[PDB]
Structures are given as C-alpha cells and as structure tokens.
Amino acid sequence: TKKIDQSLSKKLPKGTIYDPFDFSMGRIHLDRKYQANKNSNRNDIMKSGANPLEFYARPRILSRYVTSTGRIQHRDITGLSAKNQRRLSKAIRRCQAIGLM
Amino acid sequence: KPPVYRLPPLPRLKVKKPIIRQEANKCLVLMSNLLQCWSSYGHMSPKCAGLVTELKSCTSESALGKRNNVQKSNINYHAARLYDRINGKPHD
Amino acid sequence: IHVVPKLPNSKALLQNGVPNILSSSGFKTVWFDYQRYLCDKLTLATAGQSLESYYPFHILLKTAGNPLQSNIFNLASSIHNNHLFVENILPSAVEHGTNSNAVVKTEPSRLFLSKIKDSFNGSDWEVVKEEMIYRAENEVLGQGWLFLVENNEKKLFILTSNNNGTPYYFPRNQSFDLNSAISIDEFATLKQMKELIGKSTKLNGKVQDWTMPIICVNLWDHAYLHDYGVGNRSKYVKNVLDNLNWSVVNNRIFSGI
Amino acid sequence: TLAELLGRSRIAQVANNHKPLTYTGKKFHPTHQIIETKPSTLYRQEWGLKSAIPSKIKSRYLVYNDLDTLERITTFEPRGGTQWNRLRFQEMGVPIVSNIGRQNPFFKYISRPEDESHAKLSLFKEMKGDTDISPAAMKKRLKKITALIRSFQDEFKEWLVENHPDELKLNSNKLEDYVVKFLNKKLETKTNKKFNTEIIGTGGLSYSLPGKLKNSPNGVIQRTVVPGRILNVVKENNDNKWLAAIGGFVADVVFFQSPPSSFNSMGDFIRMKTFLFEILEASMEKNGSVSMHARLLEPQ
Amino acid sequence: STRYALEHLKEGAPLKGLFSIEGLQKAWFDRVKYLDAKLNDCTNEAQQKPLETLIHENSKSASKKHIVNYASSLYNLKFSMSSLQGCIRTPPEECPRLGPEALLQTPDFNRTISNEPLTTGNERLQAALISSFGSLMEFRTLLINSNLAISGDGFTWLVARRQLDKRAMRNDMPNRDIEYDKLFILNTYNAGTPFNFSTSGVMNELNNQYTNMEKQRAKEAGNLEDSEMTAKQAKTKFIYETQQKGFSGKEVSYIPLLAIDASPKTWLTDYGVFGKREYLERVWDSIEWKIVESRLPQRTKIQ
Amino acid sequence: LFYKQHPWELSRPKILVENEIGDENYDWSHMLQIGRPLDGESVIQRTMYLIKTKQYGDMVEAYDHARYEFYALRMQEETEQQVALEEAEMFGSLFGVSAIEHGIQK
C-alpha cells in the first residue's frame, strides 16, 4: 500500500526548521498531547476585552459558547475570566428570554 | 492564567490501575485477515494463498506466536520515589 | 588562552638568533612574532568553546574531520608544526643559561641511521637530505612543511604538506596541490584515500593513522625570506637539515625500553 | 562589589526566557540559548547552572528556563539542535538576499527621507500597531497621548499662523500635512519605542555577503547540489510547488517539467528516499523565517 | 625581461604609500627574476609565446605543470601590480610596525568608504559593482576579507562572467563575445588561474578514466558489476557535471578585472607579521580604477 | 533586546562554566578580547563602555554603534571559515562526513 493515514504522518510547514526527531512517532504523539485551542484568544471576542453583555441581541456570537442543545459551557471549557463568564451567561439567559436564542 | 490545582498533602501518590499498551498478537491479526479474505473472495479462494502461508508460519510452533507477552508499568515506582521532592511542600 | 611557550636560552635566541640558520631578526619573525600571531588567533577562534582546554595537537585531531572547523584546524596545525620545527633546530633543548655551555655536538643515533638504510634502500643520510631538498622545491610551490615521518611499519619516509598540513592524519596531509594539474597516479592515491575514509563506521567519519613526525622544516615565508630571500629556500632547507638538534630528533624515534 | 560581578556573570549573560521548552507550533528560528558543557565538566554533572544536571544526560547541549523551581528541579531539555541547522545552512553556501532589494541591515548606510514621506503611516502606527494590546492599556494610549499632544497646542497655534497662514484661511488639506510633520519633528527628540525589537536582517543565521564564487578542484561551482527529502507525494494544496526537507529547513521545490515516477511508486513513503536538489535562492521574511527555493535535480 | 615590466615600477624607486624601496625590490623585481628564470628553465618557448598562451596551451597536463605554475604565477603577479598607483598615506617604512594589538582592532569596512571608483570618473564600474555586490561597502568588505582569509599564497580576483556559454563560433567576435553578465569575486591559491575554461572538468575527466580502468580490470577478474558502484559512480559523475554547468550550456569563463596578492612575500617585508590588514587597506587606497574600468567588458543587456 | 533582534545568535552554544572571574583584564575600547568569545555579551559590554565614557549620550545610539562593530567582526569570521574550507579542498583535504550528510544519516 502506498497510502498512510494523516494521523500517522506529520506535514512540516514551509519556512520552518526541523530536527530528525520531527519524523518520528514521538513527535506525532507529542503534538496530540500538547494540542490545545490556544489560538482561540485571537479569535475569541470574549477574550479580547469586549463586554459580553453587549452581545445579548447577537445570537450568532453567543451561540459559539453553548452546546448543540443550548447548554452554556462551563468556564473550564470556555477559558474565560470569572467576570466574562458571569457576564456571558447573563447575556445568554437574557437572549433566551427575549426570544432570539 | 490556566488554573493550576494544587493538591493537599497526601499519604501517597499512586495510580490505581496503571494503563499499559498491549500490542496486538501478530498471529491473531493474521487469522483475522485470512478470515476476512475468505469472507469476501470465498473460502480457499486463490487470493488468500499468501495469508494461509503466513498464518501457518506464525502458528507453526505456537498458536499465538513466540512473543514477549509481558509488560508492566513503573509509574507507581517513580511516583512514590519523586513525590516528596516535587510536591512543593513547605519546609518543616 | 593559548600562550606562546617559553623557549630554552631565550635571551641568546633574541640576541644571536639560531646560529647557521636564522639571524636574530629572522627568528623573531618565525617564532616570537608568528607564534604570537597564531596563538592569539587560535584563542579568538576557540575561546568560549570546549576546544579552549585542549592543547593544539589534540585540537587538530579533534577538528581534523570537521569541514567547517578547518580554520581552527589550520591554526592548531601551524602552531604545533612551528614548535616542532623550532624544537629540532634549537641549539640546545636544555637551558644552559647559567651553565654557559657552548659545546653541543649532536649526531644522528644508530637507530636513526639504521632505519634510514632500511627504508631508503641503503641510501645514506646525506643522500636522503638531497632528496628532501629536492622534494621541497618541486612539491611545495608556495607555503608548506617538509617532514621526515615514521609510519606503523617502522619505515621512515618523506612527506610534504601545502600550507598547514598535518603529518599525523593522512586525510589532511595536503600533499597534492589540486590548483595545478595532477597525473593519473596522483588521482589514484586520492581516490584510494577517499575509499578508506568511507570504510570507517564512525559517525565522525574518522580513520586511524599512526604516522609520527621525526624532523620538521618550516617552508613558510616567515622563516626564510628575511635571511635568504625569494628563490633561496633550497639554501635555507640545506642549512636546517645540516644543523638539526639530534638530541630531540633521536628522542622522537621509539626505542622500546 | 558582588552585585557588579553578578551582573557580568555568565549566568546573567543569558537573557531571561520563559518560552515553552516543549513547543508544538511552527518553529522559524531558535527560541532558547543553547548551553554547552565540556566533556570534563559533563563527567561531573557540572554545567555552570545552580544544580547538577542528572547523570542520565549524555548530551553536551541543553536549553533551560529556570535555574530552580518549586518542584526542586531544573527546567531543561537536553537538546542543542538549532546549531546544526545554522551550520548546515553555512555549508550550503547560499547567501540570504532581500526579495525587496532593501539596504543591507549589517552596513551603516546613509539613508534619506525617501520612505519618510509616509509620516502619517508610521506616526500613527504607534497607536494603530496595537494588534495584540489590552482593551484598557491600549485605551490608555488615547488619554495619555491626548494630553501630551494637547500640550503642544500653543506651539502649533503660533507656528502654523507664522509659517503657513494661507492654509489656515484657505484649506486644511495642507494643514493636516503640517500637523503630521510637526508631531514627528517634536517626537524624533522624544523616545517612543526608541529600541526596536524587530529581527534585523538574517537575525544572525548568515553573515555571508553575496558575490563570492566557490572555487573547487573541478573548477568554479556554478550550481549548489544538496541532498534532500521530498515530504509530500502531492504538491502543496493550492500551490504549484512541493515541499522538501533540506538541511534542517523546509523548502519549496520546483521541478524542471515533470515529477519523477518514484513519487507515484513510493507514495506516502516518499520521504524515505533522498534526492539531489539545487538551491536557487534564499530569502528572509519578517516572521523570521527563511524562504528557501530549490530544484529537484534528477539524474539525466 | 622588459616583457614583464610596468611603467610605475622602477628599480630604486618606491611605490609611495604601499611599498618602500626594499619592499618593491623583494616584492616585484627580486620576485619576477626568479619566476622568469624558472619559466626559462622549464620551457624554451618562454621568450616566444605570451604568458597567457602558455597558461592556456600547457594546461590540464601533469607533465607540463611546472611550465604552467611559473607561467601563471608571473601573470597573476603582473596583473596584481598593474592596477596599483599609490596613495597619500604615510610611507610604510616611516610608520611604526603593527604588533599583536592589531589583531584586536575592529575593522571599519562596513561604516566608511574611501577611493570609490565613481569619484575618479569610472561611473560605469561603480554601477556594475553596486549591481553585483549591492554597494561599494559590501564590495570592499567582501574583497578585503576574502584576501585576508587566504592563509598562504593566492590572489583575490574581481572577475566578470562571460555570457557566451553557447560555445558556437566562440571567441570569434571581440565584442559580441566580450560581454559580461555579472561580476564576482574569486580566490585562487598558489599558481591557480581565474579563467575556469581551461581547467573545469579536470577531476570529472580523470574520474572517468579511473572508473573505466577499474571496470576493465574487473572484467579481467570476471565480476558481476556491483550493487552500488554503478549507482555511486553515477551519482559522483552526475554531481560533478551539474556543479560545472552554466546558465545556458557549460562554457563558463571569467574576465580578470582586478587582482590582490595575498602572498606573504608581498607584505611581510614592509608591514610585518601583524600587518596584512594594513597592507590590504593601503592596497584599496592605491587602486587605479581607470585600469579596471578599461578591462570591464560591455554589459550583456539581454534583460 | 539583542537576542530578540538576532534570534539565531541563541543557536551559538554558550558555556556557563566559569574559568576565573578575577583574571578578566578587558579593555572595552575594542570589542574583541583575548580569553572570551565574540557573542552578544561583547556587544553589551561595548555599549556600556561607550555610555560610561560619554562618547554617546543615548543608550540606543551606543547600542547601534556597538552592533555595527559586531557585524563587521562576524562577517570577517564567516569569510575566514568559508575560505579555509575552500583552500583546504584545493590542496587535497578529504572529509568523511559533512554536516549536511550527518543530518541525512540521522
């Protein structure tokens, strides 16, 4: 067979430097273990400094912090500060009461 | 910012059932493929000849092959050895 | 920091040079100036690295196989070679500064003259000196070194190097000048050497060479120009080989006692 | 004093670094200072750090973050492999060239205001170059600056009525120009980001000047041939070039016309084989990466 | 031998600012006399053919190497002293001799410049140097450093690649064939020549003789080739060829424009063991850029 | 600042093991010193000497002046190594494994 699963091969980006270890399975496993959604902050409005309570009439943004059934995600999952989690949950509950979410 | 959770002082640091990787038996997988080969191309089909030949060699002397079927975890040995050093406990 | 070694009877060397070879000015150029020049450059190249704690001979061996450390290798090889040359042309290795000794009559030992006959098909020492002078004039167009070396087979033979070529490690002898044209026989020697270096299994691609120098003559312009001049390097090599310190050269031949 | 000595100590010379020792993102340049110990000191676990490095370590190179921690260990990784990437680049003898034809950053050139005609582009870059700034510290750039700029109102309420009164009575199209120049002229004396942290040129990867030819026993070398590896068996998606792994760098390989048949044959194991490449050019991007372009020299 | 004489080099007179009287004797007069004698003691045609003819006629032969080593050593030395005029700097014999402290001085070749070609009217040479090296500070640094690096005998050349890699009717039109694509710096060692047309391929040619001779001895032995001797010799030959090819074809030649001598013979007498960089600084301030601009071919404006 | 501007200077190994701090007799009028490598610290100490001697007033100006001295020394060393390798190969020096080859094998 001339095919390998993507999970068993690492694609080295262009312009990056590499070591021989980057072709091993240890690199594959190490990349899975340390795979965190750290790029969310730059794409996370609520981790930017905006007040989540100003989005109570924008269900599309709020729908990014609820599960498929509408259950607000725990702070352990959203990664927000206590204040933003508190404000975001209020926004979602207000949005639900208005008839938008 | 990622919340660090610090444990209280503990009587021990131990994993109840340390996970171990049990590599799959080579003879059992050979048998699982041959059985599948017969399911599609038919029993005794000439397409599964190589599978039959390989299975016979794998199982010729031992039905599960000559393998080092022994693997144990050492996490509990190291955890008990290093806990007092790394727990960050205040001085006496 | 690599410092210039102190030489025996240095006050005499700074006043009357080396009798019959170099004058006071000629010796200041070859040793007191050039050796300082080399050691300072070596210190600048190696300071802050692991090589700073190693003697020049060990540095050249450690770096002999590393292409991008050739600059360090050249400096280490030149420093080691220059003190090999200055040591066997020196009036007396012992420091007769307070003994005012003026009688140092050193002559080839029996073991040296026995190995010369064995390795040169019965040729005498005088004839071998003529071959050494000839080899230097026809094989070293510019800077380099002339060596009489001994190999693992107890045979003395003549090796010439271009610029800073070590006698110890044949891959870096630099005995063939590839700027000019080479014969098929010389290309065969180079091709055979390349094959030997490829048979080594070490990850550093290094081979074993047990060749050791016995006599060293500096063929650089820093040693002869001021006293002999352009074109008179064969008169310089003749004087060096006729006024060698044989207490040092004899001690370089392994006896086994 | 002891404080003076400490500031100049070899440990002080290493700049503070808390960057992850285990980083799984894109690496474009070294992030940690390589520490080396001599063989004699390694035999005694001496690295010039606070504590002895565990004897298990056989490498002579490491990178560290903290001398000591609350876990009573040193935070270090026994690797020094970014040095071999730099030395392999040196062996390829390809000078780094500017794709924009900018002045050489390593030479003290006499520059002029040719690019200074964008005073309003960069004077406001100080407040507009805030891509990743706090929502309130960036807002402190609005009141703190407003007061500073508002303190020059009297100076600009007299200079403008003494040097360009016509514009004040005709149009503000030129007044805005006199404003941008005024602040910059009164800011060049000031020190706003007087130290620039941007990478300077190659960043230290290469100090080789373009122009020199490589003499060889077989004549002057006209094309640099370097062994490499093809990573993918299908060109980069959306790009007309494949990717190769040459000397610790990932390059874009352009093929003469066709792709060798070993590609289809090998498939996803193509990286298992070594090919010969020619390094066309090497460029440096602002992210601090090296843009190496290669060519799959195939036996012909 | 007036055949090897320059009008600015007069016995008894010093090249002011670079060589003293004793330093110009040893460097040039006492040196040409030796090289001439050796060239007259190897070939009887020395006083018959031009030096460059001997260099390009007796090349690639191991039996005539001594004719070409002395011939190309005297050519390089003349071509080096030809572009030198002198400087207003203090005479070398009146300045103190640089000592070990010189090795610790920082070179200022990236901050300042002096004696640029354009300042003397050679405007076409300055544009070419800026185009190929980026600037005249880059060129000066890359030229003084390349010569300073040379340990023993050698020359640092300013060359111009000839854009006539076609090989068809080559060397038939003294203008259509004299066209330069780009300028470069090249180092030659001992008696090496900067042309590269009469010596490129030498190792590849000798390598192919060795393999054929070994292959014919193997046939006598009766061997079944080898698993990787046909794939290793092939790779060695494929790399030898791909590294000597030109942009279009494999005829890459170079036109000497300038040459700086690195041999200690030139600078050891006047500047001492520690004064090579001082020598190279005064050499740069002693280059007559008119002679160099004269040698410069006409640009190949294919662009 | 220096290592943020020159990330690849980090790849040059540094030895933290001291020899004898009391022996350091350095004249920072020049950047090169006998006994220590040329590295980022050479730039920092040169910058401090300039500000201490009051040749320059602003730290930035002294730092830039030192940086250019550092570039000049780095360019002379990059050429000495390239040329030394080239010159050795021209006299028949042979090398088993190059850095590029070492990486391929690993």
Side-chain angles (χ1 to χ4, degrees), chain A residues 40-85:
Chain A
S40 72
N41 185 6
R42 292 197 180 183
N43 290 336
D44 190 322
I45 299 163
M46 305 315 177
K47 297 179 178 185
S48 182
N51 180 5
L53 201 53
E54 300 188 346
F55 297 81
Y56 80 91
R58 298 190 63 194
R60 196 184 85 251
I61 307 304
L62 299 185
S63 290
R64 304 174 182 175
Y65 303 88
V66 301
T67 66
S68 53
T69 68
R71 285 166 57 92
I72 298 160
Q73 295 183 304
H74 199 274
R75 186 189 173 199
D76 290 350
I77 294 159
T78 71
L80 300 171
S81 64
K83 168 166 71 190
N84 288 325
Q85 180 76 9

Side-chain angles (χ1 to χ4, degrees), chain E residues 48-96:
Chain E
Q48 295 177 26
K49 311 167 160 59
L51 272 184
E52 187 166 1
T53 300
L54 302 190
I55 293 165
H56 296 319
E57 172 179 359
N58 292 335
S59 63
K60 307 212 81 169
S61 56
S63 56
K64 303 294 183 179
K65 83 165 198 167
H66 294 84
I67 299 153
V68 175
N69 291 343
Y70 290 111
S72 55
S73 297
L74 183 47
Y75 174 98
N76 295 2
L77 182 63
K78 193 182 190 189
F79 190 102
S80 180
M81 299 284 191
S82 58
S83 298
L84 290 178
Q85 65 202 327
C87 49
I88 67 184
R89 308 173 73 152
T90 298
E93 71 282 2
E94 306 180 1
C95 303

Side-chain angles (χ1 to χ4, degrees), chain E residues 18 26 63 83 88 104 106 110 112 180 185 208 211-212 216 219 233 239:
Chain E
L18 192 64
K26 289 160 176 192
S63 56
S83 298
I88 67 184
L104 301 182
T106 301
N110 62 314
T112 70
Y180 82 91
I185 284 165
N208 299 338
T211 63
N212 300 339
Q216 293 160 38
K219 291 178 180 179
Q233 295 169 1
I239 296 164

Side-chain angles (χ1 to χ4, degrees), chain A residues 4-57:
Chain A
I4 308 165
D5 187 4
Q6 278 190 349
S7 69
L8 303 176
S9 176
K10 175 169 171 55
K11 303 181 178 178
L12 305 181
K14 192 272 169 179
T16 58
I17 64 184
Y18 69 88
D19 294 1
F21 169 87
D22 291 355
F23 295 116
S24 74
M25 288 286 195
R27 170 56 61 186
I28 301 297
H29 301 132
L30 198 65
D31 288 348
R32 297 166 178 174
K33 172 170 184 166
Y34 294 87
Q35 182 184 16
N37 295 3
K38 307 185 179 183
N39 302 335
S40 72
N41 185 6
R42 292 197 180 183
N43 290 336
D44 190 322
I45 299 163
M46 305 315 177
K47 297 179 178 185
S48 182
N51 180 5
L53 201 53
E54 300 188 346
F55 297 81
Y56 80 91

Side-chain angles (χ1 to χ4, degrees), chain D residues 10 13 29-30 33-36 83 86 88 90-91 194-196 199-200 203 207 215-217 229, chain F residues 1 5-15 17-19 60 75 78 81 86 90 99-100 103-104:
Chain D
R10 291 198 196 189
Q13 298 171 25
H29 53 78
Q33 170 67 60
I34 296 168
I35 307 304
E36 173 178 40
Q83 74 185 302
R86 176 181 51 86
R88 277 160 199 164
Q90 189 181 350
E91 284 199 350
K194 202 70 181 181
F195 282 122
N196 182 25
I199 296 163
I200 298 172
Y207 297 88
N215 215 344
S216 179
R229 293 179 189 274
Chain F
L1 177 67
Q5 294 179 352
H6 316 89
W8 286 93
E9 288 293 319
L10 297 171
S11 71
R12 299 184 173 257
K14 162 186 284 292
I15 293 176
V17 176
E18 299 272 9
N19 294 315
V60 189
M75 286 182 293
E78 172 67 353
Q81 293 167 21
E86 174 179 300
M90 290 304 295
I100 292 287
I104 287 289

